[PDB]
Design a protein around this ligand. Structure first.
Ligand SMILES: *[C@@H]1O[C@H](CO)[C@@H](O)[C@H](O)[C@H]1NC(C)=O
Length: 198
């Protein structure tokens, strides 16, 4: 095993807005002046270096400013070791709004808005329009519209819209909007019912 080890070891660690995470950097060293440094936001909270074999970095009540690349550097007997890990701070939406909130057969469009979300990158944040547990075939996605929420941290409001196909017979009792967020080691989802009236 390498002299320097970080737990957790993954190159990207995701932390929710308001949550906590602890990164422990351990350096095995027989010599006396072994040093462990946590840095990466040196222009900000700053770098911290100690004569030690163990240094723990803790993010508490994570804010978006906690995000960024951290590096643990260990020095033992003139040799230097490192581990680089990106902290990703995200906010999964705490509310979806569907418009219209209920559909009548024949309605041509439905919109689903995710509130207070970040990141908005479509490679992480996705929207699906389902009937049963399957994607509704023929639903044309008009593309996410992104805006800031009103005024730490600035979060976003993201709306997907679909032109609807005929819903067919038998008419489904509901559609569902699902917002899904995919990050390293994580898949988060929010499915909201859309009643179909009449
Ligand atoms: C967490 O952070 C926010 C500031 O963004 C603060 O308003 C809230 O009270 C904090 N919670 C604690 C425990 O300090």
């Amino acid at each position: 095993v390498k002299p320097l080890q970080v737990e957790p070891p993954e190159p990207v660690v995701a932390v929710a807005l308001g949550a906590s995470r602890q990164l422990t950097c351990r350096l095995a060293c027989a010599d006396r002046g072994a040093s462990v440094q946590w840095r990466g936001l040196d222009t900000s909270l700053g770098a911290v270096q100690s004569d030690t074999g163990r240094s723990v970095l803790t993010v508490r009540n994570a804010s978006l400013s906690a995000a960024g690349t951290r590096v643990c550097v260990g020095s033992c007997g003139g040799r230097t070791f490192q581990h680089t890990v990106q902290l990703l701070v995200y906010a999964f939406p705490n509310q979806l709004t569907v418009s219209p909130a209920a559909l009548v057969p024949g309605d041509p469009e439905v919109a689903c808005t995710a509130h207070k979300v970040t990141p908005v990158d479509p490679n992480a944040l996705s929207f699906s329009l389902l009937v049963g547990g399957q994607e509704l075939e023929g639903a044309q996605a008009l593309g996410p519209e992104v805006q800031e929420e009103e005024e730490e941290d600035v979060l976003f409001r993201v709306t997907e819209r679909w032109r609807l196909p005929p819903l067919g017979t038998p008419v489904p009792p509901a559609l569902y909007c699902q917002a899904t967020m995919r990050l390293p080691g994580l898949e988060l989802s929010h499915r909201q019912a859309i009643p179909v009236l009449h």
